[PDB]
A = this chain, B = another copy of it.
């Protein structure tokens, strides 16, 4: 089923998203 693996990957992806969105916010809130 790979549930532990899926969840681990989700955490990795969400961490990446949190950074990309930080960069967007930094230019948009300026």
**Residues of chain A having any CB pair with chain B under 8 Å:** 1-11, 13-18, 20-30
Contacts and interface: CB of A to CB of B under 8 A. Distances in A.
A27 B26 CA distance: 11
A15 to B, nearest CB: 5
Contact of A30 (B5, B9, B27): B27
B2 A4 contact: yes
A3 to B, nearest CB: 5
Given A1-B8, A6-B11, 13 more contacts: A2-B4, A2-B7, A10-B11, A10-B14, A13-B18, A14-B17, A18-B20, A20-B21, A21-B21, A21-B25, A23-B28, A27-B28, A27-B30
